[PDB]
Amino acid sequence: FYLLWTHKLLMLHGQKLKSRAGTLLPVIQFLQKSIQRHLDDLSKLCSWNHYNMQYALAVSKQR
Amino acid sequence: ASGIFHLHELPEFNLIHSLSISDQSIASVAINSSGDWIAFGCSGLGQLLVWEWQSESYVLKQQGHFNSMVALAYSPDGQYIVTGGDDGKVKVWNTLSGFCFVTFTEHSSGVTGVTFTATGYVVVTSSMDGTVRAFDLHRYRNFRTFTSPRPTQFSCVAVDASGEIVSAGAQDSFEIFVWSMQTGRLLDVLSGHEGPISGLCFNP
Amino acid sequence: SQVRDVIGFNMAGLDYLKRECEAKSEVMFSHLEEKKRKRKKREKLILTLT
Amino acid sequence: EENPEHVEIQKMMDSLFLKLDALSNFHFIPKPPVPEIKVVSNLPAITMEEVAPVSVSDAALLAPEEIKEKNKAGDIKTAAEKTATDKKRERRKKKYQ
Amino acid sequence: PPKVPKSAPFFIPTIPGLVPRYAAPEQPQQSKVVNLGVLAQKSDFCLKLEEGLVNNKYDTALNLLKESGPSGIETELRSLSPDCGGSIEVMQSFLKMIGMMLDRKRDFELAQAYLALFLKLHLKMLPSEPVLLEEITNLSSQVEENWTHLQSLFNQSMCILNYLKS
Amino acid sequence: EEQVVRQQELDNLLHEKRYLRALGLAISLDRPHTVLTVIQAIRRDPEACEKLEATMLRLRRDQKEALLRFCVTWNTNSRHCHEAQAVLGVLLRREAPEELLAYEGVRAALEALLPYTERHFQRLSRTLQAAAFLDFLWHNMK
Amino acid sequence: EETRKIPVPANRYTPLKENWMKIFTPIVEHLGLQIRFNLKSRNVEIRTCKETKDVSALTKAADFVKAFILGFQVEDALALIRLDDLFLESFEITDVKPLKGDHLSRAIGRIAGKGGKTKFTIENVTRTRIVLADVKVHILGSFQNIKMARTAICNLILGNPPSKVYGNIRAVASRSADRF
């Protein structure tokens, strides 16, 4: 839900925020790390499923 | 008092096993309701230890000397804090959890200054050893060490935003030493000050 | 995405073969001598300013 | 370690020197670091971390180049493939060394 | 390692644990020598999984799974193997547990975490048994469509923020 | 006289642009660099690309052992990793996992293949993050 | 006053004799019970008395003698009186799988191993004491520790190679006592 909110505001107002990017540094940093945090663990786990499952789906085919 | 603890089963007085915790004495000991965990405190170094006897492993083990810390820094993200102390240990803490997770003991004497690079997960320290050492958090190694041609003691550290330049100042030689990060050779010695250098800072 | 997926599929396959080779090693584990040989094999040397 | 006298003398130096620098409030002439060789082993970087129930960084603890050394060009050519210039360069380098 | 005396006896008192992995320790002055078929032989988690097959409800097993700690979770999934005493029918129940959590789209991180451990433990036994495959084909599609939608939303956010920095 | 006869055939096949057939002989002659140039030429050509995995199955066992140890060196170079990973894909998918353990030198080869693969996966991941910038330009398009 | 009697056969008659004082002393001194061994009935008798202060002693005394009759050492059996959690378990081999003759003989061989290696190996990792008498297998230990013993033994009976059997127990027993 908050991902969609952030995505919409960013995609709408990024060009306007670029001009005043100098005074918004403490905010962006904050936002960035939060959006980073969750992402990393998911990128560790979901892919560890996906490819591995595909690998299993490969072996069943060669048999 | 010697820093060892013993386990016994009282009605028969059977020694199960014994350990040595530290050179200092053990001040206080407590055991939880379940009996699996035993708590030890050593006021000599302020060391706290939780021991699970059945699993023969530590659950928690921390140590911090009193009045040791002198330095501070933040990671660019703001997620970690690196500090150095008079004892000579460099410690990285995670602010969310509140526990130290990596400690570097390469330095022999106390660390006077500490800094993160602006981009990478690299921590640079300057010590009374006469050395400025850089550590990486990806592989946990001291990959670069800078020393002066002359035996001198450094009081502070400053690193450029790009991270190519490393600089330090001395207690006695009254001159700022500047080294290159990637090559590791002494680029230059800046002179002109009279008296020790109180502090340095790069323009971001 | 396709280039990443090809590399990603090799990541999973190689990891499984890594675990099978380590599983075989446990069978042989004279145990101290075998463990010493395994540790001696995985020891590299680096330059360091002490 | 096999000479008891040198071991005994070194321990006397340690006790004395830690006393002496304290009187100077840690103001002494430092010892330059001597270069040495240290043994790192190929196992995950969790082992170097402090005791904790969760691990923040997962890594090999050892660089990919260290595990398998790579030539400068990054490619290997057998003697059959080597052309005229390639053999000339290897001759030139060997005489250069 | 801790120093252990040789004179120490073989049996030392035991603490069962903060949470009981096995439901029933014993059946006031009853006997302690018994034949087989009396002591508990199936984990409480395995018992809940078996019931989940009949009624297509795994919430009871889910609550135990989210309450036991990581050392306990690894033991439970290791016990699920046929070698350790868990039927291949029961492993079918655990795969159906994971799928249900993806349809509800709640507790998303636990779904990926537990499934990743299960894949690590019994990958070698997996392609041989055909029944588990049909669960994977459903599971493989769901994790692909869920991650891809989220991965795009994550990636567009970070690239915009970096562009604001430079 | 055997090598020069075999060498003569290889040069003819390269001259005739018959890369699929030339792949077999250069492996037997133990030419890693020549095979690497052949693999790149196959993937540039459209029709040869799909028939790559079909050809690789026709190779006998010792050619697969030599080709697998060729991939270790190629994977080290970032410029040459893509075709090295392409060959490794055919090995993992077509061939049985227990049979991969039967190969000679697979244990030593497996040590070097993993660390460089993690580097490549991370590098492609950052490119995907940068590639999302195309979507941002599209919404700001007029 | 109530009594319970436990039989003893020919192969365990003599070990009871040199170790009679070892078994006699704890019961009368600590559990406060009167003990007699009838020669004619070949059967040991336990009874309560005025000096018996606790009612649980009769159950513990019956188990303590039972373990010694089964072939357990006196000190290991003595742990039953002091430790409540210890259980002793006994099952037949033919229950898990029906085997006849030579195949039954090889099954005992797989569990025991050359020189007793397999039984001794399972003994340390599971921290259980195992007595193997032909088709009957006896395990003494804690409730959790019994399962790791029986899981290894039954898998050994069903034809699994011993090398796999050691690995699975070692993996599971390592994480058994972590306690969260």
UniProtKB/Swiss-Prot annotation, chain A:
Localization per record: Nucleus, Nucleolus
Source species, domain of life: Eukaryota
On subunit structure and binding partners, the annotation says:
Part of the small subunit (SSU) processome, composed of more than 70 proteins and the RNA chaperone small nucleolar RNA (snoRNA) U3.
Give the family this protein belongs to, as stated in its UniProt record.
Belongs to the WD repeat PWP2 family.
Biological role: Part of the small subunit (SSU) processome, first precursor of the small eukaryotic ribosomal subunit. During the assembly of the SSU processome in the nucleolus, many ribosome biogenesis factors, an RNA chaperone and ribosomal proteins associate with the nascent pre-rRNA and work in concert to generate RNA folding, modifications, rearrangements and cleavage as well as targeted degradation of pre-ribosomal RNA by the RNA exosome.
Q: What is this protein called?
A: Periodic tryptophan protein 2 homolog
Q: Which organism is it from?
A: Homo sapiens
- The encoding gene is PWP2
UniProtKB/Swiss-Prot annotation, chain D:
Q: How is it modified after translation?
A: Phosphorylated in M (mitotic) phase.
Chain residue numbers at which the record places covalent cross-link Glycyl lysine isopeptide (Lys-Gly) (interchain with G-Cter in SUMO2): 68
Q: Where in the cell is it found?
A: Nucleus, Nucleolus; Chromosome
Composition bias, Basic and acidic residues: 71-88
Q: Which family does it belong to?
A: Belongs to the MPP10 family.
Function text: Component of the 60-80S U3 small nucleolar ribonucleoprotein (U3 snoRNP). Required for the early cleavages during pre-18S ribosomal RNA processing. Part of the small subunit (SSU) processome, first precursor of the small eukaryotic ribosomal subunit. During the assembly of the SSU processome in the nucleolus, many ribosome biogenesis factors, an RNA chaperone and ribosomal proteins associate with the nascent pre-rRNA and work in concert to generate RNA folding, modifications, rearrangements and cleavage as well as targeted degradation of pre-ribosomal RNA by the RNA exosome.
Tell me, how does this one assemble? Part of the small subunit (SSU) processome, composed of more than 70 proteins and the RNA chaperone small nucleolar RNA (snoRNA) U3. Component of a heterotrimeric complex containing IMP3, IMP4 and MPHOSPH10. Interacts with IMP3 and IMP4.
Q: What is this protein called?
A: U3 small nucleolar ribonucleoprotein protein MPP10
Source organism (scientific name): Homo sapiens
Q: Which residues of the full protein are shown?
A: 488 to 584 of 681
From Swiss-Prot, chain E:
- Which tissues does the record link to its expression? Expressed in heart, placenta, liver, skeletal muscle, kidney and pancreas. In ocular tissues, strong expression in iris, sclera, ciliary muscle, ciliary body, retina and optic nerve.
The record's subcellular location field reads:
Nucleus, Nucleolus
Subunit and partners = Part of the small subunit (SSU) processome, composed of more than 70 proteins and the RNA chaperone small nucleolar RNA (snoRNA) U3.
Task: Give the free-text miscellaneous remark of the entry.
Answer: Depletion of WDR36 mRNA in cultured cells causes apoptotic cell death and consistently associates with a reduced 21S rRNA and delay of 18S rRNA maturation.
Any domain commentary?
A: The WD repeats are grouped into two tandem seven-bladed beta-propeller regions.
Q: Give a short account of what the protein does.
A: Part of the small subunit (SSU) processome, first precursor of the small eukaryotic ribosomal subunit. During the assembly of the SSU processome in the nucleolus, many ribosome biogenesis factors, an RNA chaperone and ribosomal proteins associate with the nascent pre-rRNA and work in concert to generate RNA folding, modifications, rearrangements and cleavage as well as targeted degradation of pre-ribosomal RNA by the RNA exosome. Involved in the nucleolar processing of SSU 18S rRNA. Involved in T-cell activation and highly coregulated with IL2.
* Name of the protein in its database record: WD repeat-containing protein 36
State the organism named in the record.
Homo sapiens (Human)
Traced from the root, the source organism's taxonomic lineage reads: Eukaryota, Metazoa, Chordata, Craniata, Vertebrata
Gene behind this chain? WDR36
Q: Which residues of the full protein are shown?
A: 724 to 892 of 895
From Swiss-Prot, chain F:
TM annotation in the entry: none
Q: Where in the cell is it found?
A: Nucleus, Nucleolus
Q: Which cysteines are joined by disulfide bonds?
A: none
Subunit text: Part of the small subunit (SSU) processome, composed of more than 70 proteins and the RNA chaperone small nucleolar RNA (snoRNA) U3.
Q: What does this protein do?
A: Part of the small subunit (SSU) processome, first precursor of the small eukaryotic ribosomal subunit. During the assembly of the SSU processome in the nucleolus, many ribosome biogenesis factors, an RNA chaperone and ribosomal proteins associate with the nascent pre-rRNA and work in concert to generate RNA folding, modifications, rearrangements and cleavage as well as targeted degradation of pre-ribosomal RNA by the RNA exosome.
Q: What is this protein called?
A: Transducin beta-like protein 3
Could you tell me the gene encoding this protein? TBL3
Task: Please give the first and last residues shown and the length of the full protein.
Answer: 648 to 789 of 808
